[PDB]
Amino acid sequence: GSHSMRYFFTSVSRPGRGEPRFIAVGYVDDTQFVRFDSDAASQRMEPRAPWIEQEGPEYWDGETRKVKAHSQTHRVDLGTLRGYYNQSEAGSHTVQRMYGCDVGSDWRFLRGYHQYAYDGKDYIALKEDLRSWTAADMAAQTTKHKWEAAHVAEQLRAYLEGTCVEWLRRYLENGKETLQRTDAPKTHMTHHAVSDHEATLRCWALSFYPAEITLTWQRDGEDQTQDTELVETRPAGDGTFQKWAAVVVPSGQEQRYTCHVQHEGLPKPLTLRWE
Amino acid sequence: MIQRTPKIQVYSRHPAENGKSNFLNCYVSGFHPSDIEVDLLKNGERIEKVEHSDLSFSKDWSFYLLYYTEFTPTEKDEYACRVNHVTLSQPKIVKWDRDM
Amino acid sequence: KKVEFKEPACNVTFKSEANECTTLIKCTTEHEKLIIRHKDKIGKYAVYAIWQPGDTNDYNVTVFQGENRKTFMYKFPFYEMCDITMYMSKQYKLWPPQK
Amino acid sequence: LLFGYPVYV
């Protein structure tokens, strides 16, 4: 199957109250494996998945040094950005960064990513060809120019198509029991009386992995929509995910509706009918 | 700047049964800035033993966090999640309806 | 030139994940290096796996120093710990897994 | 594994 590795970085300035709050987290597909929190006692990159603990001291010392370097750069970025936008030295601002790679079913490089956001808005992003940048405003243009001269894209391309993919494969193997698995959803339907004229039918999908899933309602065959409510897929806390889809139906007509579940772990789509 | 109101989902890890240990989850997502206050309440009172996931975010840069605590459902006890964000004028309270 | 090998320091930890009992055997040594062997796995720092009723309870660790080495054999009560670790999944009959 | 080249905006 296809897999991905992603690192997410968030740095928030808190002027007058010490250094910015920096949080870094690493993911392989839908499971987190490492984190770094500037406010944590350790001040070390820390494991968030037992399988990453198979990496030795050199890994942890090396990743700790590199994550602190990322923290340091973002600390400077916050200063640079407020300067770029002529903002007050007393306000709180946020810089976010994400980068990573995807591999196809062959586990060979598929695509790479490297982008930034300032105060919740796109700032600059590496394009798909991994050779050009996408800058929004004037400020981002300044950054772009600097990165082009510093050959940042060239170094990222080498990483994304090389080290990134190679280590992703290493992780996939070292944590195969959890990463290369598929947990089919456990499904059931609930009924909720809303009035003596109608009721809410809710289709649940629980304990599934990966997070990708499709839940849809149909009536006597036709596809229901706009009448169906969906919630964002959410974490159960045990490494698995949940999701539900609902539809308001007229009392006595419940059995006319059907829920359809599509998931990687299901040999074939599921169909649930109430009662 | 950019400000997004947090979406809030309060639910249990497993379908709830009185007497069986379970986990109460409060998943907050789609918010920005990251500064947010989240408390899990039992009969209106704040639960002290509450842990949360490491701050992360989606493709649109909006943040998401999972707050959780181990609890044993009772027929009487009421649980809820209290969230306050810059986007919220007052704390928002989403009750655990135990519908699953 | 000879070596009076010290026994490696090993710790076995358990984590409930997706209703399976994951096990992690992590060890250290003051010597050059070590190799942990459990089931079909080998590791210089730790060995990760999912433990299910019927699985082996053995592991061994070899410490090295130059051209010298010594292997230490171990048994561990994996079921006992997994049973404790999977308490919540057991309530909903999600553990032990189907044989 | 983390990218090892420090980058500044």
Read off the CATH number of the domain in which A225 is found: 2.60.40.10
DSSP percent split of chain D into helix, strand, coil, nearest 5: 0, 0, 100
- A275, part of any domain: no
**Number of other CB atoms surrounding residue A164 within 10 Å:** 27
Residue type, A154: E
Experimental method: X-ray
Q: Are B31 and B65 in contact (CB under 8 A)?
A: no
CB contact under 8 A, B1 and A119: yes
Whole-number CA gyration radius for chain C:
16
Token couple for A49: 């998945």
* DSSP letter, residue B16: -
A165 lies in the same domain as A200: no
A177 lies in the same domain as A243: no
DSSP percent split of chain A into helix, strand, coil, nearest 5: 25, 40, 35
Q: Are A32 and A87 in contact (CB under 8 A)?
A: no
- For the domain covering B1-100, report its CATH number: 2.60.40.10
Compute the C-alpha angle A88/A92/A97, nearest 5°.
115
Helix (H) or strand (E) holding B81: strand B79-84
Sheet with A109-118: strands ordered across: A46-47, A31-37, A21-28, A3-12, A94-103, A109-118, A121-126, A133-135
Per CB-CB distance under 8 Å, the chain C contacts of B23 are: 88
Domain end marker among A162, A181, A200: A181
Per CB-CB distance under 8 Å, the chain A contacts of D3 are: 7, 66, 99, 155-156, 159, 163-164
A146 lies in the same domain as A259: no
CB contact under 8 A, A120 and B32: yes
Sign of the torsion formed by the C-alpha atoms of A35, A40, A45 and A50:
negative
Q: Output b/e per residue, A91-130; b: 16+ Cβ within 10 A.
A: ebbbbbbbbbbbbeeeeebeebbbbbbbbbebbbbbeeeb
Q: Is C54 left (phi over 0), alpha (psi -120 to 50) or beta?
A: left
A265 lies in the same domain as A194: yes
**Number of other CB atoms surrounding residue B20 within 10 Å:** 15
Query: Which residue is associated with the tokens 């998931």?
Result: A263
Distance from CA of B23 to the nearest CA of C (A): 9
Helix (H) or strand (E) holding A140: helix A138-149
A224 lies in the same domain as A202: yes
Say if strands A21-28 and A3-12 run parallel, antiparallel, or are unpaired. antiparallel
Instruction: Work out how many domains chain A is built from and give that number.
Output: 2
Give domain limits for chain B. Answer: 1-100
Residue type, A113: Y
A57 lies in the same domain as A117: yes
Q: Are A201 and A189 in contact (CB under 8 A)?
A: yes
**Number of other CB atoms surrounding residue D1 within 10 Å:** 20
Of all residues in chain A, the one with the smallest CA distance to B70 is A237
Token couple for A239: 């490494």
Of all residues in chain D, the one with the smallest CA distance to A154 is D5
Domains within chain C, CATH numbers bracketed: 1-99 (2.60.40.3530)
Resolution in A: 2.0
Q: Among candidates C55, C48, C56, which has minimal Cα distance to C15?
A: C48
A209 lies in the same domain as A124: no
Q: Are A112 and A161 in contact (CB under 8 A)?
A: yes
Q: Which of D2, D5, D8 has the CB atom closest to A155's CB atom?
A: D5
CATH of the domain at A133: 3.30.500.10
- Write A187-193 long-range contacts (CB < 8 A, 24+): A187/A259, A187/A261, A187/A270, A187/A272, A188/A272, A188/B15, A188/B100, A189/A259, A189/A272, A189/A274, A190/B99, A190/B100, A191/A254, A191/A274, A192/B99, A193/A251
Of all residues in chain B, the one with the smallest CA distance to C86 is B21
Q: How many contacts, defined by CB atoms under 8 Å, are there between A and C?
A: 47
Which residue in B12, B40, B54 has the most chain A C-beta atoms within 10 A of its own C-beta, making it the best mutation to test that interface? B54
- Strand, helix or coil at B92? strand
- Strand, helix or coil at A142? helix
Q: Are A252 and A242 in contact (CB under 8 A)?
A: no
Domain end marker among A140, A163, A181: A181
A38 lies in the same domain as A72: yes
CB contact under 8 A, C16 and A207: no
Tell me the C-alpha distance between A240 and A219, whole Å: 30
Containing structural domain, residue A255: 182-270
Domain end marker among A181, A200, A217: A181
SS3 for chain C is CCCCCCCCEEEEEEEEECCEEEEEEEEECCCCEEEEEECCEEECCEEEEEECCCCCCEEEEEEEECCEEEEEEEECCHHHHHHHHCHHHHHCCCCCCCC
**Chain D residues with a Cβ under 8 Å from any Cβ in chain A:** 1-9
Per CB-CB distance under 8 Å, the chain C contacts of B20 are: 91-92
A90 lies in the same domain as A226: no
Q: Are A205 and A215 in contact (CB under 8 A)?
A: yes
Q: Are B26 and B38 in contact (CB under 8 A)?
A: yes
